[PDB]
Protein backbone atom coordinates (compact mmCIF):
# COMPACT_ATOMS: atom_id res chain seq x y z
CA UNK A 1 0.00 0.00 0.00
CA UNK A 2 2.61 2.52 1.16
CA UNK A 3 5.60 0.28 0.35
CA UNK A 4 6.45 -2.45 -2.15
CA UNK A 5 8.22 -5.69 -1.24
CA UNK A 6 10.17 -6.31 -4.45
CA UNK A 7 12.59 -9.13 -5.26
CA UNK A 8 15.66 -8.36 -7.38
CA UNK A 9 17.16 -11.41 -9.11
CA UNK A 10 20.92 -10.98 -9.47
CA UNK A 11 22.64 -12.34 -12.57
CA UNK A 12 23.86 -15.33 -10.53
CA UNK A 13 20.14 -16.14 -9.90
CA UNK A 14 20.34 -15.13 -6.22
CA UNK A 15 17.46 -13.10 -4.80
CA UNK A 16 17.49 -9.90 -2.74
CA UNK A 17 14.17 -8.82 -1.22
CA UNK A 18 13.85 -5.03 -1.02
CA UNK A 19 11.11 -3.26 0.91
CA UNK A 20 10.79 -0.13 -1.22
CA UNK A 21 9.32 3.27 -0.44
CA UNK A 22 6.82 4.82 -2.83
CA UNK A 23 9.19 7.71 -3.63
CA UNK A 24 12.21 5.46 -4.27
CA UNK A 25 13.42 5.69 -7.87
CA UNK A 26 14.77 2.83 -9.94
CA UNK A 27 18.23 4.42 -9.92
CA UNK A 28 18.32 4.15 -6.12
CA UNK A 29 17.66 0.41 -6.26
CA UNK A 30 20.30 -0.09 -8.95
CA UNK A 31 22.79 1.84 -6.82
CA UNK A 32 21.80 -0.30 -3.83
CA UNK A 33 22.39 -3.46 -5.89
CA UNK A 34 25.79 -2.17 -7.01
CA UNK A 35 26.78 -1.76 -3.36
CA UNK A 36 26.10 -5.42 -2.58
CA UNK A 37 27.81 -6.58 -5.79
CA UNK A 38 30.91 -4.43 -5.08
CA UNK A 39 30.16 -3.07 -8.56
CA UNK A 40 31.64 0.33 -9.45
CA UNK A 41 30.81 0.96 -13.13
CA UNK A 42 27.03 1.06 -12.68
CA UNK A 43 26.50 2.91 -15.97
CA UNK A 44 26.38 -0.15 -18.24
CA UNK A 45 23.60 -1.83 -16.23
CA UNK A 46 19.94 -1.37 -15.30
CA UNK A 47 16.90 -3.37 -14.15
CA UNK A 48 13.98 -4.87 -16.04
CA UNK A 49 10.72 -6.70 -15.37
CA UNK A 50 8.09 -8.78 -17.14
CA UNK A 51 5.25 -6.44 -18.10
CA UNK A 52 1.60 -7.35 -18.72
CA UNK A 53 2.63 -8.81 -22.09
CA UNK A 54 5.64 -10.63 -20.58
CA UNK A 55 7.92 -8.32 -22.57
CA UNK A 56 11.26 -7.26 -21.08
CA UNK A 57 10.75 -3.56 -20.33
CA UNK A 58 13.69 -1.84 -18.66
CA UNK A 59 12.68 0.26 -15.67
CA UNK A 60 12.76 4.05 -15.76
CA UNK A 61 15.75 4.71 -13.50
CA UNK A 62 14.68 8.34 -13.05
CA UNK A 63 11.05 7.53 -12.13
CA UNK A 64 9.90 5.75 -8.95
CA UNK A 65 10.07 1.96 -9.20
CA UNK A 66 7.17 1.23 -6.83
CA UNK A 67 4.60 2.68 -9.24
CA UNK A 68 6.05 0.89 -12.27
CA UNK A 69 5.65 -2.64 -10.90
CA UNK A 70 2.14 -1.94 -9.60
CA UNK A 71 0.88 -0.36 -12.88
CA UNK A 72 2.86 -2.32 -15.53
CA UNK A 73 4.15 -5.65 -14.11
CA UNK A 74 2.83 -9.17 -13.39
CA UNK A 75 4.67 -9.64 -10.08
CA UNK A 76 6.90 -7.23 -8.10
CA UNK A 77 10.12 -8.86 -9.32
CA UNK A 78 12.72 -7.06 -11.42
CA UNK A 79 15.86 -8.60 -12.92
CA UNK A 80 19.42 -7.29 -13.01
CA UNK A 81 20.94 -7.06 -16.46
CA UNK A 82 23.05 -5.16 -18.97
CA UNK A 83 21.19 -2.36 -20.75
CA UNK A 84 24.28 -1.05 -22.61
CA UNK A 85 26.31 -3.69 -24.46
CA UNK A 86 29.76 -2.29 -25.28
CA UNK A 87 31.38 -3.00 -28.67
CA UNK A 88 34.77 -3.62 -27.03
CA UNK A 89 34.64 -5.74 -23.89
CA UNK A 90 38.26 -4.66 -23.53
CA UNK A 91 36.78 -1.27 -22.58
CA UNK A 92 35.62 -2.67 -19.23
CA UNK A 93 38.48 -2.01 -16.80
CA UNK A 94 37.29 -2.79 -13.26
CA UNK A 95 37.43 -6.45 -12.29
CA UNK A 96 33.95 -6.87 -10.79
CA UNK A 97 32.37 -4.97 -13.69
CA UNK A 98 33.81 -7.71 -15.92
CA UNK A 99 32.46 -10.62 -13.87
CA UNK A 100 28.90 -9.29 -13.99
CA UNK A 101 29.34 -8.76 -17.73
CA UNK A 102 30.55 -12.37 -17.91
CA UNK A 103 27.41 -13.56 -16.13
CA UNK A 104 25.12 -11.61 -18.47
CA UNK A 105 26.94 -12.79 -21.60
CA UNK A 106 26.82 -16.40 -20.38
CA UNK A 107 23.09 -16.07 -19.68
CA UNK A 108 22.58 -14.76 -23.22
CA UNK A 109 24.16 -17.93 -24.62
CA UNK A 110 22.57 -20.48 -22.28
CA UNK A 111 19.05 -19.05 -22.71
CA UNK A 112 19.31 -18.48 -26.47
CA UNK A 113 19.29 -14.69 -26.85
CA UNK A 114 22.51 -15.08 -28.85
CA UNK A 115 22.11 -18.17 -31.07
CA UNK A 116 25.23 -20.32 -31.38
CA UNK A 117 25.87 -23.44 -33.44
CA UNK A 118 26.64 -26.87 -32.01
CA UNK A 119 30.41 -26.33 -32.18
CA UNK A 120 30.30 -22.77 -30.83
CA UNK A 121 28.21 -23.96 -27.88
CA UNK A 122 30.88 -26.61 -27.23
CA UNK A 123 33.93 -24.33 -27.23
CA UNK A 124 32.07 -21.79 -25.08
CA UNK A 125 31.32 -24.29 -22.30
CA UNK A 126 35.02 -25.16 -22.04
CA UNK A 127 36.14 -21.66 -21.05
CA UNK A 128 33.09 -21.45 -18.77
CA UNK A 129 34.08 -24.52 -16.74
CA UNK A 130 37.64 -23.27 -16.20
CA UNK A 131 36.11 -20.11 -14.67
CA UNK A 132 32.89 -21.43 -13.12
CA UNK A 133 34.47 -24.54 -11.55
CA UNK A 134 38.21 -23.92 -11.98
CA UNK A 135 41.34 -25.98 -12.50
CA UNK A 136 39.99 -29.32 -11.34
CA UNK A 137 41.21 -30.93 -8.14
CA UNK A 138 40.55 -34.21 -10.01
CA UNK A 139 31.51 -32.52 -11.98
CA UNK A 140 30.05 -31.41 -15.34
CA UNK A 141 26.68 -33.17 -15.03
CA UNK A 142 26.05 -30.89 -12.04
CA UNK A 143 24.84 -27.65 -13.64
CA UNK A 144 23.78 -26.46 -17.12
CA UNK A 145 26.68 -25.93 -19.59
CA UNK A 146 24.76 -25.91 -22.93
CA UNK A 147 21.89 -23.87 -24.62
CA UNK A 148 18.41 -25.34 -25.11
CA UNK A 149 19.00 -26.88 -28.54
CA UNK A 150 18.22 -32.74 -26.56
CA UNK A 151 19.05 -36.30 -27.57
CA UNK A 152 20.57 -38.24 -24.69
CA UNK A 153 23.54 -39.58 -26.66
CA UNK A 154 24.45 -36.25 -28.25
CA UNK A 155 24.57 -34.86 -24.70
CA UNK A 156 27.10 -37.57 -23.83
CA UNK A 157 29.23 -36.84 -26.90
CA UNK A 158 29.40 -33.07 -26.37
CA UNK A 159 30.02 -33.30 -22.62
CA UNK A 160 33.18 -35.32 -23.27
CA UNK A 161 34.21 -32.84 -25.97
CA UNK A 162 34.00 -30.17 -23.27
CA UNK A 163 35.74 -32.53 -20.83
CA UNK A 164 38.78 -32.73 -23.15
CA UNK A 165 39.08 -29.05 -24.02
CA UNK A 166 38.86 -28.69 -20.22
CA UNK A 167 42.44 -29.92 -19.76
CA UNK A 168 43.85 -27.79 -22.59
CA UNK A 169 42.72 -24.73 -20.61
CA UNK A 170 44.64 -25.49 -17.42
CA UNK A 171 46.73 -23.23 -15.22
CA UNK A 172 45.07 -20.07 -16.57
CA UNK A 173 43.25 -17.68 -14.26
CA UNK A 174 39.47 -17.75 -14.11
CA UNK A 175 39.39 -13.96 -14.76
CA UNK A 176 41.17 -14.68 -18.05
CA UNK A 177 38.85 -17.56 -18.96
CA UNK A 178 36.01 -15.07 -18.47
CA UNK A 179 37.70 -12.56 -20.79
CA UNK A 180 38.34 -15.06 -23.59
CA UNK A 181 34.78 -16.33 -23.11
CA UNK A 182 33.39 -12.82 -23.60
CA UNK A 183 35.60 -11.72 -26.51
CA UNK A 184 34.18 -14.63 -28.55
CA UNK A 185 30.52 -13.89 -27.76
CA UNK A 186 31.59 -10.26 -28.28
CA UNK A 187 32.03 -10.99 -32.00
CA UNK A 188 28.90 -13.05 -32.72
CA UNK A 189 25.80 -12.00 -34.63
CA UNK A 190 22.86 -10.93 -32.51
CA UNK A 191 25.29 -10.03 -29.71
CA UNK A 192 23.86 -7.22 -27.60
CA UNK A 193 20.79 -6.89 -29.84
CA UNK A 194 17.26 -6.52 -28.46
CA UNK A 195 14.27 -7.03 -30.76
CA UNK A 196 10.78 -5.61 -30.25
CA UNK A 197 7.68 -6.77 -32.18
CA UNK A 198 6.17 -4.27 -34.61
CA UNK A 199 4.47 -3.97 -37.99
CA UNK A 200 6.01 -2.58 -41.17
CA UNK A 201 4.57 0.12 -43.44
CA UNK A 202 2.85 -2.73 -45.32
CA UNK A 203 1.41 -4.36 -42.20
CA UNK A 204 3.93 -7.21 -42.38
CA UNK A 205 5.07 -8.07 -38.87
CA UNK A 206 8.75 -7.55 -38.04
CA UNK A 207 11.24 -6.99 -35.19
CA UNK A 208 12.82 -3.52 -34.53
CA UNK A 209 15.66 -2.50 -32.18
CA UNK A 210 18.79 -0.35 -31.71
CA UNK A 211 22.13 -2.03 -32.67
CA UNK A 212 25.61 -0.42 -32.26
CA UNK A 213 25.72 0.68 -35.94
CA UNK A 214 22.15 2.08 -35.77
CA UNK A 215 18.43 1.17 -35.88
CA UNK A 216 18.15 -2.39 -37.28
CA UNK A 217 14.87 -3.69 -38.78
CA UNK A 218 14.82 -7.49 -39.23
CA UNK A 219 11.83 -9.07 -40.97
CA UNK A 220 9.98 -12.19 -39.83
CA UNK A 221 9.12 -13.09 -43.45
CA UNK A 222 12.86 -13.44 -44.10
CA UNK A 223 13.45 -10.09 -45.81
CA UNK A 224 16.99 -8.77 -45.53
CA UNK A 225 17.47 -6.76 -42.31
CA UNK A 226 18.05 -3.05 -42.91
CA UNK A 227 20.41 -1.11 -40.62
CA UNK A 228 19.79 2.67 -40.77
CA UNK A 229 22.45 9.04 -41.53
CA UNK A 230 19.53 9.16 -39.03
CA UNK A 231 18.77 12.86 -38.52
CA UNK A 232 16.77 12.13 -35.35
CA UNK A 233 14.25 9.77 -33.75
CA UNK A 234 10.63 10.58 -32.93
CA UNK A 235 7.43 8.96 -31.68
CA UNK A 236 3.80 9.70 -32.56
CA UNK A 237 0.61 7.88 -31.45
CA UNK A 238 1.22 4.11 -31.82
CA UNK A 239 4.01 4.78 -34.34
CA UNK A 240 7.78 5.23 -34.07
CA UNK A 241 9.67 7.12 -36.77
CA UNK A 242 13.22 7.92 -37.86
CA UNK A 243 14.24 10.90 -40.00
CA UNK A 244 16.77 11.14 -42.83
CA UNK A 245 11.89 9.53 -43.40
CA UNK A 246 10.54 6.18 -42.19
CA UNK A 247 8.00 5.09 -39.58
CA UNK A 248 6.96 1.83 -37.91
CA UNK A 249 3.87 0.96 -35.86
CA UNK A 250 3.71 -0.92 -32.55
CA UNK A 251 1.10 -2.50 -30.28
CA UNK A 252 0.01 0.63 -28.40
CA UNK A 253 1.22 4.12 -27.55
CA UNK A 254 2.83 2.85 -24.34
CA UNK A 255 5.10 0.45 -26.25
CA UNK A 256 6.32 2.94 -28.86
CA UNK A 257 7.17 5.80 -26.49
CA UNK A 258 9.10 3.22 -24.46
CA UNK A 259 11.24 2.34 -27.48
CA UNK A 260 12.06 5.99 -28.22
CA UNK A 261 13.73 6.31 -24.81
CA UNK A 262 16.02 3.29 -25.21
CA UNK A 263 17.00 4.18 -28.78
CA UNK A 264 18.01 7.72 -27.84
CA UNK A 265 19.56 6.24 -24.69
CA UNK A 266 21.65 3.76 -26.66
CA UNK A 267 22.30 6.49 -29.24
CA UNK A 268 23.57 8.71 -26.41
CA UNK A 269 25.61 5.86 -24.93
CA UNK A 270 27.29 5.03 -28.24
CA UNK A 271 28.08 8.61 -29.29
CA UNK A 272 30.02 9.02 -26.02
CA UNK A 273 32.01 5.82 -26.44
CA UNK B 1 52.87 -15.40 10.99
CA UNK B 2 50.52 -18.09 9.69
CA UNK B 3 46.79 -17.36 9.84
CA UNK B 4 46.33 -20.84 11.32
CA UNK B 5 49.12 -20.20 13.84
CA UNK B 6 47.87 -16.73 14.79
CA UNK B 7 44.61 -18.55 15.51
CA UNK B 8 46.31 -20.98 17.89
CA UNK B 9 47.81 -18.22 20.04
CA UNK B 10 44.35 -16.69 20.39
CA UNK B 11 42.83 -20.10 21.12
CA UNK B 12 45.60 -20.83 23.62
CA UNK B 13 45.06 -17.53 25.45
CA UNK B 14 41.35 -18.35 25.61
CA UNK B 15 41.89 -21.96 26.70
CA UNK B 16 44.53 -21.13 29.33
CA UNK B 17 42.23 -18.42 30.73
CA UNK B 18 44.63 -15.57 29.97
CA UNK B 19 41.96 -13.36 28.38
CA UNK B 20 40.17 -13.15 31.74
CA UNK B 21 43.36 -12.03 33.50
CA UNK B 22 44.44 -9.50 30.87
CA UNK B 23 40.95 -7.97 30.67
CA UNK B 24 40.76 -7.24 34.39
CA UNK B 25 44.06 -5.33 34.41
CA UNK B 26 42.83 -2.91 31.72
CA UNK B 27 41.55 0.31 33.29
CA UNK B 28 37.94 1.25 32.60
CA UNK B 29 38.65 4.97 32.06
CA UNK B 30 41.47 7.56 31.88
CA UNK B 31 43.78 7.70 34.95
CA UNK B 32 44.32 11.46 34.43
CA UNK B 33 42.58 14.02 32.09
CA UNK B 34 39.29 12.11 32.56
CA UNK B 35 37.23 15.27 33.20
CA UNK B 36 33.74 15.32 31.57
CA UNK B 37 32.69 18.71 33.01
CA UNK B 38 30.76 19.64 29.87
CA UNK B 39 28.73 16.41 30.01
CA UNK B 40 28.35 16.71 33.80
CA UNK B 41 26.61 20.09 33.48
CA UNK B 42 23.03 20.37 34.79
CA UNK B 43 21.84 21.78 31.45
CA UNK B 44 23.24 18.66 29.74
CA UNK B 45 21.91 16.03 32.16
CA UNK B 46 18.75 15.74 30.04
CA UNK B 47 21.00 14.71 27.13
CA UNK B 48 22.54 11.58 28.70
CA UNK B 49 20.93 8.16 28.88
CA UNK B 50 23.23 7.14 31.73
CA UNK B 51 24.76 9.87 33.88
CA UNK B 52 27.88 7.72 34.46
CA UNK B 53 28.77 7.11 30.77
CA UNK B 54 30.09 10.41 29.41
CA UNK B 55 32.63 11.64 26.85
CA UNK B 56 35.84 13.40 27.73
CA UNK B 57 35.87 17.14 27.08
CA UNK B 58 38.84 16.99 24.69
CA UNK B 59 37.38 14.22 22.48
CA UNK B 60 33.63 14.84 22.66
CA UNK B 61 31.85 15.43 19.37
CA UNK B 62 31.35 19.18 19.39
CA UNK B 63 28.18 20.41 17.70
CA UNK B 64 28.03 23.95 16.36
CA UNK B 65 26.46 25.67 19.39
CA UNK B 66 22.96 27.08 19.31
CA UNK B 67 20.69 28.81 21.83
CA UNK B 68 18.76 25.70 22.89
CA UNK B 69 22.07 23.82 23.28
CA UNK B 70 24.41 26.61 24.39
CA UNK B 71 27.35 24.19 24.74
CA UNK B 72 26.64 22.31 21.49
CA UNK B 73 26.82 19.18 23.61
CA UNK B 74 26.03 15.66 22.46
CA UNK B 75 26.97 12.42 24.24
CA UNK B 76 29.42 11.30 21.57
CA UNK B 77 33.18 10.67 21.56
CA UNK B 78 35.71 10.98 18.75
CA UNK B 79 37.66 7.72 18.39
CA UNK B 80 40.86 8.20 16.37
CA UNK B 81 43.39 5.39 16.73
CA UNK B 82 46.63 4.41 14.97
CA UNK B 83 48.68 1.19 14.92
CA UNK B 84 51.97 1.13 12.97
CA UNK B 85 50.63 4.01 10.84
CA UNK B 86 47.23 2.50 10.01
CA UNK B 87 44.72 5.15 11.07
CA UNK B 88 41.12 4.67 12.22
CA UNK B 89 38.29 7.21 12.46
CA UNK B 90 35.21 6.46 14.58
CA UNK B 91 32.46 8.36 16.38
CA UNK B 92 30.85 6.46 19.27
CA UNK B 93 27.62 7.71 20.82
CA UNK B 94 24.71 6.57 22.94
CA UNK B 95 21.40 5.62 21.39
CA UNK B 96 19.50 8.83 20.67
CA UNK B 97 16.86 9.97 23.12
CA UNK B 98 13.69 11.72 21.97
CA UNK B 99 15.09 15.15 22.87
CA UNK B 100 18.49 14.38 21.30
CA UNK B 101 17.30 13.16 17.89
CA UNK B 102 17.81 16.69 16.59
CA UNK B 103 21.29 16.73 18.15
CA UNK B 104 22.06 13.32 16.64
CA UNK B 105 21.18 14.36 13.08
CA UNK B 106 23.04 17.63 13.62
CA UNK B 107 26.16 15.55 14.30
CA UNK B 108 25.56 13.19 11.36
CA UNK B 109 25.43 16.23 9.07
CA UNK B 110 28.19 18.38 10.58
CA UNK B 111 30.61 15.42 10.72
CA UNK B 112 29.72 14.37 7.16
CA UNK B 113 28.66 10.92 8.35
CA UNK B 114 27.49 8.50 5.66
CA UNK B 115 27.36 5.15 7.51
CA UNK B 116 25.60 4.42 10.82
CA UNK B 117 26.27 1.12 12.61
CA UNK B 118 23.46 0.32 15.11
CA UNK B 119 24.47 -2.73 17.22
CA UNK B 120 21.16 -2.93 19.12
CA UNK B 121 17.39 -3.26 18.69
CA UNK B 122 15.28 -0.22 19.48
CA UNK B 123 14.00 -2.00 22.60
CA UNK B 124 15.46 -5.04 24.34
CA UNK B 125 13.72 -6.56 27.34
CA UNK B 126 11.27 -3.65 27.47
CA UNK B 127 14.11 -1.17 27.98
CA UNK B 128 14.76 1.48 25.34
CA UNK B 129 18.19 1.18 23.73
CA UNK B 130 17.66 3.78 21.00
CA UNK B 131 14.72 6.00 20.14
CA UNK B 132 13.33 5.60 16.63
CA UNK B 133 15.23 8.44 14.95
CA UNK B 134 14.65 7.36 11.35
CA UNK B 135 11.17 6.94 9.82
CA UNK B 136 9.53 3.55 9.40
CA UNK B 137 8.75 2.05 6.01
CA UNK B 138 5.21 0.81 5.42
CA UNK B 139 3.46 3.54 7.41
CA UNK B 140 2.36 6.95 6.10
CA UNK B 141 5.01 8.65 8.31
CA UNK B 142 7.95 7.80 5.99
CA UNK B 143 9.47 11.24 6.69
CA UNK B 144 10.54 13.00 9.89
CA UNK B 145 12.00 16.47 10.48
CA UNK B 146 14.53 17.02 13.28
CA UNK B 147 15.63 20.63 13.46
CA UNK B 148 16.70 21.61 9.94
CA UNK B 149 17.04 18.03 8.64
CA UNK B 150 14.29 16.04 6.90
CA UNK B 151 15.11 12.32 6.84
CA UNK B 152 13.33 9.91 4.50
CA UNK B 153 13.48 6.11 4.65
CA UNK B 154 13.96 4.94 1.08
CA UNK B 155 14.51 1.17 1.09
CA UNK B 156 15.27 -1.66 3.49
CA UNK B 157 16.82 -5.09 2.78
CA UNK B 158 16.88 -7.69 5.57
CA UNK B 159 19.68 -10.26 6.00
CA UNK B 160 19.21 -12.74 8.86
CA UNK B 161 21.61 -11.12 11.36
CA UNK B 162 21.50 -7.50 10.10
CA UNK B 163 19.30 -5.02 8.21
CA UNK B 164 20.45 -2.40 5.70
CA UNK B 165 18.32 0.75 5.51
CA UNK B 166 18.96 3.51 2.98
CA UNK B 167 18.16 7.02 4.16
CA UNK B 168 18.08 10.37 2.39
CA UNK B 169 18.80 13.40 4.59
CA UNK B 170 17.82 16.88 3.39
CA UNK B 171 18.97 20.19 4.85
CA UNK B 172 15.79 22.26 4.50
CA UNK B 173 17.68 25.56 4.72
CA UNK B 174 20.30 24.82 2.05
CA UNK B 175 18.45 22.17 0.04
CA UNK B 176 21.42 19.79 0.14
CA UNK B 177 20.81 16.04 0.17
CA UNK B 178 23.00 13.18 1.35
CA UNK B 179 22.53 9.43 1.17
CA UNK B 180 23.07 7.79 4.57
CA UNK B 181 23.42 4.01 4.93
CA UNK B 182 21.93 2.68 8.18
CA UNK B 183 23.33 -0.72 9.19
CA UNK B 184 21.56 -2.35 12.15
CA UNK B 185 22.70 -5.59 13.77
CA UNK B 186 19.65 -7.51 15.00
CA UNK B 187 21.06 -10.85 16.25
CA UNK B 188 22.52 -9.67 19.56
CA UNK B 189 20.49 -11.32 22.35
CA UNK B 190 18.84 -9.42 25.17
CA UNK B 191 21.10 -11.17 27.71
CA UNK B 192 24.66 -12.19 26.89
CA UNK B 193 26.57 -12.17 23.60
CA UNK B 194 25.69 -13.47 20.12
CA UNK B 195 26.08 -17.19 19.48
CA UNK B 196 26.25 -16.91 15.67
CA UNK B 197 29.85 -15.75 15.31
CA UNK B 198 29.76 -16.18 11.52
CA UNK B 199 26.69 -13.93 11.40
CA UNK B 200 28.33 -11.17 13.43
CA UNK B 201 31.34 -11.41 11.11
CA UNK B 202 29.02 -10.79 8.16
CA UNK B 203 27.74 -7.62 9.83
CA UNK B 204 31.33 -6.36 10.01
CA UNK B 205 31.82 -7.33 6.36
CA UNK B 206 28.73 -5.37 5.30
CA UNK B 207 30.18 -2.33 7.10
CA UNK B 208 33.33 -2.60 4.98
CA UNK B 209 31.30 -3.21 1.81
CA UNK B 210 29.32 -0.03 2.49
CA UNK B 211 32.55 1.75 3.46
CA UNK B 212 34.10 0.82 0.11
CA UNK B 213 30.95 1.79 -1.80
CA UNK B 214 30.74 5.29 -0.31
CA UNK B 215 34.46 6.10 -0.57
CA UNK B 216 34.72 5.44 -4.32
CA UNK B 217 32.58 8.54 -4.98
CA UNK B 218 34.43 10.96 -2.66
CA UNK B 219 37.64 12.02 -4.48
CA UNK B 220 38.84 14.62 -1.85
CA UNK B 221 39.30 12.84 4.01
CA UNK B 222 36.92 9.92 4.55
CA UNK B 223 34.26 10.51 7.18
CA UNK B 224 34.24 8.61 10.48
CA UNK B 225 31.75 5.81 10.96
CA UNK B 226 29.10 6.18 13.66
CA UNK B 227 28.70 3.19 15.99
CA UNK B 228 26.00 3.46 18.63
CA UNK B 229 24.54 1.11 21.22
CA UNK B 230 22.56 1.79 24.40
CA UNK B 231 25.38 3.77 26.02
CA UNK B 232 27.74 3.63 23.03
CA UNK B 233 30.39 1.76 25.04
CA UNK B 234 30.05 -2.05 25.39
CA UNK B 235 28.63 -3.40 22.09
CA UNK B 236 29.97 -0.27 20.45
CA UNK B 237 33.46 -1.14 21.66
CA UNK B 238 33.07 -4.73 20.45
CA UNK B 239 32.44 -3.53 16.89
CA UNK B 240 35.31 -1.03 16.97
CA UNK B 241 37.83 -3.35 18.62
CA UNK B 242 36.91 -6.29 16.38
CA UNK B 243 37.19 -4.29 13.16
CA UNK B 244 40.57 -2.88 14.24
CA UNK B 245 42.13 -6.27 15.04
CA UNK B 246 40.75 -7.90 11.88
CA UNK B 247 42.72 -5.32 9.90
CA UNK B 248 45.83 -6.18 11.93
CA UNK B 249 45.18 -9.78 10.89
CA UNK B 250 44.51 -8.79 7.27
CA UNK B 251 47.62 -6.63 6.87
CA UNK B 252 49.94 -9.00 8.75
CA UNK B 253 50.71 -7.15 11.96
CA UNK B 254 51.45 -8.16 15.54
CA UNK B 255 48.25 -8.47 17.57
CA UNK B 256 48.20 -6.86 21.04
CA UNK B 257 44.49 -6.81 21.90
CA UNK B 258 44.80 -5.25 25.40
CA UNK B 259 47.06 -2.49 24.06
CA UNK B 260 44.47 -1.44 21.47
CA UNK B 261 41.55 -1.66 23.90
CA UNK B 262 43.50 0.39 26.45
CA UNK B 263 44.05 3.01 23.74
CA UNK B 264 40.34 2.97 22.87
CA UNK B 265 39.38 3.53 26.51
CA UNK B 266 41.60 6.62 26.59
CA UNK B 267 39.10 8.22 24.18
CA UNK B 268 35.81 6.77 25.48
CA UNK B 269 35.40 5.21 28.91
CA UNK B 270 34.25 1.61 29.36
CA UNK B 271 34.73 0.60 25.72
CA UNK B 272 34.03 -3.14 25.81
CA UNK B 273 32.13 -3.12 29.09
CA UNK B 274 31.89 -6.75 30.25
CA UNK B 275 34.14 -9.81 30.31
CA UNK B 276 31.67 -11.65 28.06
CA UNK B 277 32.01 -8.84 25.51
CA UNK B 278 35.80 -9.12 25.63
CA UNK B 279 35.96 -12.90 25.20
CA UNK B 280 33.48 -12.40 22.36
CA UNK B 281 36.12 -10.37 20.50
CA UNK B 282 38.61 -13.21 20.96
CA UNK B 283 36.07 -15.75 19.69
CA UNK B 284 35.12 -13.54 16.73
CA UNK B 285 38.77 -13.10 15.74
CA UNK B 286 39.34 -16.86 15.99
CA UNK B 287 36.28 -17.65 13.86
CA UNK B 288 37.38 -15.11 11.24
CA UNK B 289 40.82 -16.71 11.03
CA UNK B 290 39.15 -20.09 10.35
CA UNK B 291 37.78 -18.55 7.09
CA UNK B 292 38.83 -21.66 5.08
CL1 LIG C 1 26.46 0.03 25.53
Numbering used by the authors:
A (entry chain B): 20 to 157, 163 to 173, 176 to 254, 258 to 273, 279 to 307
B (entry chain A): 878 to 1097, 1100 to 1171
Give the article text.
PTPN21 belongs to the four-point-one, ezrin, radixin, moesin (FERM) domain–containing protein tyrosine phosphatases (PTP) and plays important roles in cytoskeleton-associated cellular processes like cell adhesion, motility, and cargo transport. Because of the presence of a WPE loop instead of a WPD loop in the phosphatase domain, it is often considered to lack phosphatase activity. However, many of PTPN21’s biological functions require its catalytic activity. Combined with biochemical analysis, we have found that PTPN21 PTP is weakly active and is autoinhibited by association with its FERM domain.
To help crystallize the FERM-PTP complex, we generated a mini PTPN21, replacing the disordered region between the two domains with a flexible linker. After adjusting the linker length, we managed to crystalize the FERM-PTPC1108S complex and determined its structure at 3.0 Å. The mini PTPN21 structure showed that the FERM F1 lobe binds to the α3 and β5 regions of PTP and buries an area around 886 Å2. The interaction interface can be further divided into three parts. In the top part, highly conserved residues from FERM α1 region (R59, E57, R55, and Q54) interact with residues from PTP α3 (R1089, S1086, and E1083) through hydrogen bonds and electrostatic interactions. In the middle, FERM β2 forms an antiparallel β sheet with β5 from PTP, which is stabilized by main-chain hydrogen bonding and side-chain hydrophobic interactions. In the lower part, R1031 from PTP β5 is sandwiched between E42 and E47 from the FERM domain, and E42 also forms a hydrogen bond with N1019. Mutation of critical interface residues in either PTP (R1031A and R1089A) or FERM (E47A and E57A) abolished FERM-PTP association. Several mutations found in patients with cancer [E42K, R59Q, and R1089H, from The Cancer Genome Atlas (TCGA) and Catalogue Of Somatic Mutations In Cancer (COSMIC) databases] are located in the FERM-PTP interface. Normally, PTPN21 is in an auto-inhibited state, where the FERM domain interacts with the PTP domain and stabilizes the WPE loop in the open (inactive) conformation.
